Amino acid sequence: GLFGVLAKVAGHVVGAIAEHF
């Protein structure tokens, strides 16, 4: 139930952070 949501911030994060950076 925990990690199940962790996916919401694992794989797409870089795609965003790399946008402003």
Experimental technique for the deposited model: NMR
CA angle at 16 for the pair 11 and 21, rounded to the nearest 5°: 125
As a whole number of angstroms, the distance between CA 19 and CA 5 comes to 23
As a whole number of angstroms, the distance between CA 3 and CA 17 comes to 21
As a whole number of angstroms, the distance between CA 6 and CA 21 comes to 23
Residue type, 15: G
Q: Which two tokens stand for residue 11?
A: 């794989």
As a whole number of angstroms, the distance between CA 15 and CA 11 comes to 8
As a whole number of angstroms, the distance between CA 2 and CA 21 comes to 29
Q: Which two tokens stand for residue 18?
A: 């790399």
